[PDB]
Amino acid sequence: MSAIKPDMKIKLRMEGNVNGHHFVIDGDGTGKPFEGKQSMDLEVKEGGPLPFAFDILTTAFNRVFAKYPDNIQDYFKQSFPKGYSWERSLTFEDGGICNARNDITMEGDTFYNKVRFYGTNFPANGPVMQKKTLKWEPSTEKMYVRDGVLTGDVETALLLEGNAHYRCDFRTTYKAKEKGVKLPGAHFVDHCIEILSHDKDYNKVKLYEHAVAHSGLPN
């Protein structure tokens, strides 16, 4: 019997600053850790309407919601009940840079998330500050160990209006709270993130993510 139930609740608070614009966003959702699926309702509480593309934030709103096969060590499920934290750099092709972190805890059937998101050096004429993004392309996260730390690299892109892509490189470090959770072997995580619904200025958003771990093969 596991600390992690087939159905778990999610409670989040994000505070952040992009190009000097302060905001606070709350989230409430549910997910299925063993199926690799989560959805959540987000609401901007302060700083709305946001003057930048909501899409830059969405990967910051937990790899516990990833379907892991038996033959890959699941570092994220093994980290509970005490939990884990991640730190992420997002590097955009036009010099925009973000730093995000999440400290994740579990109380009963609920994951609590303390999220911080800091963004700077977005050009005022670029697609983030002009709100020209449409979605993230599905991508594959490469997981590996660097200097004894579990590291995930993604090379991906935002689709823009007008048949263009805006490229972004992600690097995330993941750290169990508990001393002694064994690191996994190198592997991949396929993921897809989608905004299912939104209101006029993206003050209320429903967000969905699906993630599957694998070793790079078909069988």
Residue numbers in the entry: 1 to 61, 65 to 222
Sentences from the paper on this structure:
In this study, we probed the light-induced reverse reaction, from the Trans to Cis chromophore conformation, initiated with 2 ms 405 nm pulses at a range of optical flash energy densities (0.1–6.7 mJ/mm2) after the initial Cis-to-Trans photoconversion had been driven to completion using ∼13 mW/mm2 of 473 nm CW illumination. This is due to thermally driven ground state isomerization occurring within the 10 ms duration of the X-ray probe due to laser and X-ray induced heating (discussed in detail below). We conclude that the initial population offset seen in the crystallographic data at 0 mJ/mm2 energy density of the 405 nm illumination is due to increased thermal recovery caused by X-ray induced heating. The crystallographic determination of Cis concentration at zero power density of the 405 nm laser is systematically larger than the spectroscopy-based determination. The difference between the crystallographic and spectroscopic quantifications is assigned to the x-induced heating, which drives population across a 91.5 kJ/mol barrier to reform the Cis state.
The specific rsFP used, rsKiiro, is a mutant of Skylan-NS33 specifically developed for ultrafast time-resolved crystallographic studies due to its ability to form crystals that diffract to high resolution (∼1.1 Å for single-crystal cryo-MX), high photoswitching quantum yield (∼18% Trans-to-Cis in the crystal), and high protein expression yields. The chromophore of rsKiiro is formed from the Ala-Tyr-Gly tripeptide at residue numbers 62–64 in the α helix.
